[PDB]
Curated annotation (Swiss-Prot), chains A, B:
Pathological association: Amyloidosis, hereditary systemic 5: A form of hereditary systemic amyloidosis, a disorder characterized by amyloid deposition in multiple tissues resulting in a wide clinical spectrum. AMYLD5 primarily affects the viscera, and the predominant clinical features are renal dysfunction of varying severity, and intra-abdominal bleeding. Inheritance is autosomal dominant.
GO cellular component, one term: extracellular space
Disulphide-bridged cysteine pairs: C6-C128, C30-C116, C65-C81, C77-C95
Originating species: Homo sapiens (Human)
Domain (C-type lysozyme) ranges: 1-130
Name of the protein this chain belongs to: Lysozyme C
Domain of life of the native organism: Eukaryota
Length: 130, 130
């Protein structure tokens, strides 16, 4: 599912994401926009280590979710990766909340560092009632 | 269908493979050569991950196509692996173009690295009129 900007914003707000671990709703949204274009069904293949990135927040099968086909796979989120390709993003948010608990934080996502960090991210939440 | 050298060279050319992603027709031809011997029906089973490589470009069933018997399958090319075994290589071409959109490009194939990379590949297209 491709959420519409404001629809994703209110949902992530409702799911307790604004100010989670000091991360604003506008940053979560900026991450989602650059990772997947707000599409829950997005994926990417990492040929170097045989992992795949799943969902709206592009969570990797090597450390976070289990897809049963990634060597050295840890399942810190304790959920199948398929669960992160669903229209209902509750599981993805809970896994994203786990990711940023690591001593790396939201900087775990490279694209966030390159497209959101230190930049104006107000557009992501402009006029959504959040 | 096992294509003859120049027949495939000309087909790949009309399907817009020359120069695609910086990859010359000659490199694509060298890939076809060492991956499948130019055979659209070639398949390679890997006992390790239990996945199968299909057709002329030997596209793997883990992330690219769906063969219905590979758990955790992500079907990034949006097609059954069987469509990659047909005489018409249009879908195989479309799927190959997708694979090389990744950063490493054609270097994703082990055989290309072993047999084509850093080598004079002009042999595969000479005499073909392309």
């Amino acid at each position: 599912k491709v959420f519409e900007r404001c629809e994703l914003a209110r949902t992530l707000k409702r799911l307790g994401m604004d100010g989670y671990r000091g991360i604003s709703l506008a940053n979560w949204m900026c991450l989602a926009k650059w990772e997947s274009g707000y599409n829950t069904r997005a994926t990417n293949y990492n040929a170097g280590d045989r992992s795949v990135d799943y969902g709206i927040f592009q969570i990797n099968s090597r450390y976070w979710c289990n897809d049963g086909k990634t060597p050295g796979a840890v399942n810190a989120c304790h959920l199948s990766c398929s669960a992160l390709l669903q229209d209902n993003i509750a599981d993805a948010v809970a896994c994203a909340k786990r990711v940023v608990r690591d001593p790396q934080g939201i900087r775990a996502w490279v694209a966030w560092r390159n497209r959101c960090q230190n930049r104006d991210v107000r557009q992501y939440v402009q006029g959504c009632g959040v």
